[PDB]
Amino acid sequence: SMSYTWTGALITPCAAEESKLPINALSNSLLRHHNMVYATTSRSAGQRQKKVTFDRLQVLDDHYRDVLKEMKAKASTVKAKLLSVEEACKLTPPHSAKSKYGYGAKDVRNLSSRAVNHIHSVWKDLLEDTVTPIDTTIMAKNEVFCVQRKPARLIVFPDLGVRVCEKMALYDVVSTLPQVVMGSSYGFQYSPGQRVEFLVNTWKSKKNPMGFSYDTRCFDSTVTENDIRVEESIYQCCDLAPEARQAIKSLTERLYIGGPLTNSKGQNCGYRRCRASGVLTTSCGNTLTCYLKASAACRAAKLQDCTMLVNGDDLVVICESAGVQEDAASLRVFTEAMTRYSAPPGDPPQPEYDLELITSCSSNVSVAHDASGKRVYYLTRDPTTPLARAAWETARHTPVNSWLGNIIMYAPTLWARMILMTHFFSILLAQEQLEKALDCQIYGACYSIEPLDLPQIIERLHGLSAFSLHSYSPGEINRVASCLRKLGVPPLRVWRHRARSVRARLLSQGGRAATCGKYLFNWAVKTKLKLTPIDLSGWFVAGYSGGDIYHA
Numbered sequence: 399s400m401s402y403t404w405t406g407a408l409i410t411p412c413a414a415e416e417s418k419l420p421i422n423a424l425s426n427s428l429l430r431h432h433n434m435v436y437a438t439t440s441r442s443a444g445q446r447q448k449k450v451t452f453d454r455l456q457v458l459d460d461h462y463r464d465v466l467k468e469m470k471a472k473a474s475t476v477k478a479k480l481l482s483v484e485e486a487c488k489l490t491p492p493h494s495a496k497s498k499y500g501y502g503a504k505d506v507r508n509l510s511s512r513a514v515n516h517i518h519s520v521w522k523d524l525l526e527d528t529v530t531p532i533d534t535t536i537m538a539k540n541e542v543f544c545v546q547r548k549p550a551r552l553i554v555f556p557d558l559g560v561r562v563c564e565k566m567a568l569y570d571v572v573s574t575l576p577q578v579v580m581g582s583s584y585g586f587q588y589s590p591g592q593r594v595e596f597l598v599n600t601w602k603s604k605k606n607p608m609g610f611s612y613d614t615r616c617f618d619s620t621v622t623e624n625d626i627r628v629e630e631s632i633y634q635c636c637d638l639a640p641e642a643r644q645a646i647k648s649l650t651e652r653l654y655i656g657g658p659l660t661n662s663k664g665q666n667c668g669y670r671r672c673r674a675s676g677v678l679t680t681s682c683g684n685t686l687t688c689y690l691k692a693s694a695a696c697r698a699a700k701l702q703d704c705t706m707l708v709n710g711d712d713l714v715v716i717c718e719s720a721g722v723q724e725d726a727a728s729l730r731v732f733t734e735a736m737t738r739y740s741a742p743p744g745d746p747p748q749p750e751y752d753l754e755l756i757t758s759c760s761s762n763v764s765v766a767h768d769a770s771g772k773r774v775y776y777l778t779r780d781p782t783t784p785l786a787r788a789a790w791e792t793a794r795h796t797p798v799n800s801w802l803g804n805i806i807m808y809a810p811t812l813w814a815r816m817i818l819m820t821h822f823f824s825i826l827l828a829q830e831q832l833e834k835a836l837d838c839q840i841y842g843a844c845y846s847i848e849p850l851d852l853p854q855i856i857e858r859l860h861g862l863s864a865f866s867l868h869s870y871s872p873g874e875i876n877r878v879a880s881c882l883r884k885l886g887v888p889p890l891r892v893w894r895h896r897a898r899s900v901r902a903r904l905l906s907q908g909g910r911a912a913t914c915g916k917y918l919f920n921w922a923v924k925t926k927l928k929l930t931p932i933d934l935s936g937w938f939v940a941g942y943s944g945g946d947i948y949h950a
């Protein structure tokens with residue numbers, strides 16, 4: 399079966415698109431090599447269309463069915479509740495795409511009778527009709543990158559009214575079920591620090607550890623009708639209200655398995671027979687499906703004492719080594735199995751015998767030292783993309799503030815602390831916008847966050863050590879330095895000088911601003927201050943990427 403069928407109608411933009419890096423008076427202070435930063439646009443949609451369009455074949459063996467049975471048995475212990483219209487409404491982001499039927503996100507959030515009425519009618523229709531394909535909009539995402547150009551990723555999503563209904567039927571399910579089914583393997587339950595702790599303990603729990611990342615080629619497109627029905631069969635194992643069961647059956651048949659694709663101008667672009675990137679179940683479904691195929695493939699490959707870590711289409715396995723030559727062979731068998739299950743790799747997996755050499759989600763484990771000189775493990779990543787996005791956000795206001803999310807998630811890193819914090823706090827100071835709440839994304843979910851709360855947020859997430867890490871590894875230092883030269887970003891010494899100023903300015907403001915000065919920029923002074931201790935329950939429960947989820 400073909401992932402997509404196309405009519406030849408173009409994937410069209412809904413507004414003005416910019417590909418070239420906007421430049422203002424601040425731009426040069428961060429980044430000089432402007433021509434290396436670009437944004438994807440609808441102009442490259444055609445290229446993406448070719449990539450995501452292929453035939454899927456699937457061969458399902460006993461290992462696959464064995465694992466599925468196990469997953470279903472765990473899923474049967476889950477009790478999930480229906481959300482009320484109001485509850486689902488409050489989970490809708492302020493700037494979420496408006497409905498075609500005469501109301502928008504703010505109407506939904508305010509429980510306006512027009513919105514509520516339509517939503518009830520969508521719900522009723524879901525309950526009564528289990529067959530009629532539901533319309534979706536196909537759009538080209540506008541995302542920023544550094545050269546070496548990627549074609550635009552595609553987003554497929556249904557009407558606002560349907561999205562509120564998804565929340566009603568499935569929000570509790572997708573929030574609770576994956577952890578129960580996958581246990582410690584479910585990657586969205588961990589903060590970055592907890593993730594590192596899990597990886598380290600896991601690595602040490604093997605006598606002779608080996609590990610690898612496995613990255614599927616165009617995972618969404620590899621998801622078949624079977625996979626999506628199998629996901630549904632798992633959801634349906636839950637203790638559910640009858641109404642919820644029907645809605646989940648309906649949504650699966652009418653939306654999740656496939657449907658017609660319509661562009662922004664209302665033209666039929668074609669038909670989808672794979673994973674929709676812009677539905678509530680996208681994260682949960684990809685994670686379950688990846689876990690299922692990978693667990694089964696582990697058994698086929700006879701890997702010993704396998705510990706898996708899975709989030710969305712991203713997968714890492716740590717296991718007991720059987721020797722270099724044996725391990726290499728086992729991975730080929732793993733890859734063969736995965737491919738038979740419709741999930742071939744983009745790049746072949748490689749066994750690693752050092753935790754820090756394993757790369758996944760563009761990230762790796764690295765080591766620094768705390769104030770006492772004790773070794774502290776932390777999550778870092780290549781800073782190229784974050785820095786390119788920071789440059790764009792320097793000159794343009796964007797819906798998602800990647801710099802803020804990056805500072806939160808990668809707070810312990812040399813690059814987040816020295817460059818991102820220094821730069822954006824300077825900007826915020828100059829505009830007196832420190833108290834202004836900003837939208838950002840945490841594991842696909844949108845939060846509104848005040849920059850002045852960063853120290854508190856960082857302490858809670860990463861610990862107090864995040865503010866005093868030093869003696870970074872030569873490898874990490876060199877990667878950062880190299881990236882800086884590549885992008886024409888000033889060297890770290892300049893940022894140290896700038897941070898001293900930013901710190902001083904912050905301290906002068908007093909209050910919460912002063913605390914930002916104290917904790918965020920303690921690294922910038924010679925004679926360090928004594929750093930002592932200075933809501934977040936929903937933050938690291940589940941993945942909601944593409945799921946249209948918002949929180950306060």
Ligand SMILES: CNC(=O)c1c(-c2ccc(F)cc2)oc2cc(-n3ncnc3-c3ccc(B(O)O)c(F)c3)c(C3CC3)cc12
Nearest residue numbers: 585707708709712713714756758759761762807841842943
């Ligand atoms: C199986 N992979 C892992 O569990 C991860 C390793 C990892 C694991 C093992 C290893 F050896 C090296 C790195 O490092 C990671 C870093 C992240 N972080 N950390 C900050 N931000 C992200 C991130 C990444 C992607 C997305 B996405 O668009 O859905 C997102 F929203 C946020 C995550 C986040 C849960 C997704 C997972 C892992």
